[PDB]
Symmetry: C2
Subunit: 179 residues, 2 copies
């Protein structure tokens, strides 16, 4: 029982993309990853375990984009404008891929074992923004940019960057003289 762990994780993501999260089972990934079922359960005893791994890897979509935006840390750069731009890039990528990433993320709604992992996405963004604005504002930018994405993917309404920017700006404290 070797290094098939990555093969299985990739397949698990493949299954969710095609059949959706409800079509992900120990057997479907085994079949999709072309590995015996015994392998599947050895690497991921429970289904929660396989999903926690599929989510950690899916969270890589948003993470790459944030990484491709170093200005998100530059004090002289506009926060909301760069933030609204990051969402656009993310939402503009492989539709089925964004859908998949968001699906696993939401799967934590009713699966207690996925909540910690789902928090990872938010802990990460919040920390990044915590270097540019206070913790409360950061917490709020996280919740709202999350709501904006869901809004687009749920109502099938095209992303509106300018709108996203005005909304995000309304959440950032205005600086005072002493600042």
């Amino acid at each position: 029982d070797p290094e098939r762990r990555q093969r299985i994780i990739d397949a698990a993501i493949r299954v969710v993309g095609q059949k959706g999260i409800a079509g992900l089972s120990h057997r479907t990934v085994a079949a999709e990853a072309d590995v015996p079922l015994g392998s599947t359960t050895y690497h991921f005893a429970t289904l929660d375990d396989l999903m926690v791994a599929a989510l950690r890897q899916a969270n890589e979509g948003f993470a790459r984009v944030v990484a491709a935006h170093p200005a998100l840390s530059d004090p002289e750069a506009d926060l909301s404008g760069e933030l609204a731009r990051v969402l656009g890039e993310w939402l503009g990528g492989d539709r089925t891929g964004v859908e998949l990433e968001y699906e696993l993320y939401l799967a934590a709604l009713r699966r207690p074992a996925l909540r910690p992992v789902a928090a990872e996405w938010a802990e990460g963004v919040g920390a990044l923004l915590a270097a540019r604005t206070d913790p409360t504002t950061a917490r709020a930018l996280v919740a709202v940019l999350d709501g904006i994405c869901l809004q687009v993917l749920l109502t099938d309404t095209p992303y509106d960057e300018e709108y996203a920017r005005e909304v995000l700006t309304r959440l950032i404290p205005v600086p005072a003289t002493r600042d």
Copy 2:
């Protein structure tokens, strides 16, 4: 009100339609939206399979109906807060109070309600119903504010709830109020 069996056989009237939908919700609650199907719904409603297909030809039609019934959870909490429509209403604090009430109800109900709502992510047939929901929530303060505030209300609301429900974070009303206060433009006059 017209007694059942008055204009048509009981199995074809809206009371039967309602029984199936009610059953769809019990199913989603007990075994997740993943376990929802005409077969599990027919079973939970103790009705023939052909009866579920008579009222809902495809799974989408069934899910759309389950979703609209589910939305009545958040909606009823809103209607219980008519202070919302008052011209000098405290939108931020009232909307934050509404969240606390919804979030604080039986969590199993909150979960199946949100699960059905979020299922629109990959089910194209549920999106127009979501868009409808967004418009409905916005209309709550559309008139006395602006388009941006109106279309953004659901996003702010969903984000705050998703922030609670997905990470096991306690709901924070003062925080919720602060965020909503940042979204909704403070009125110049009264």
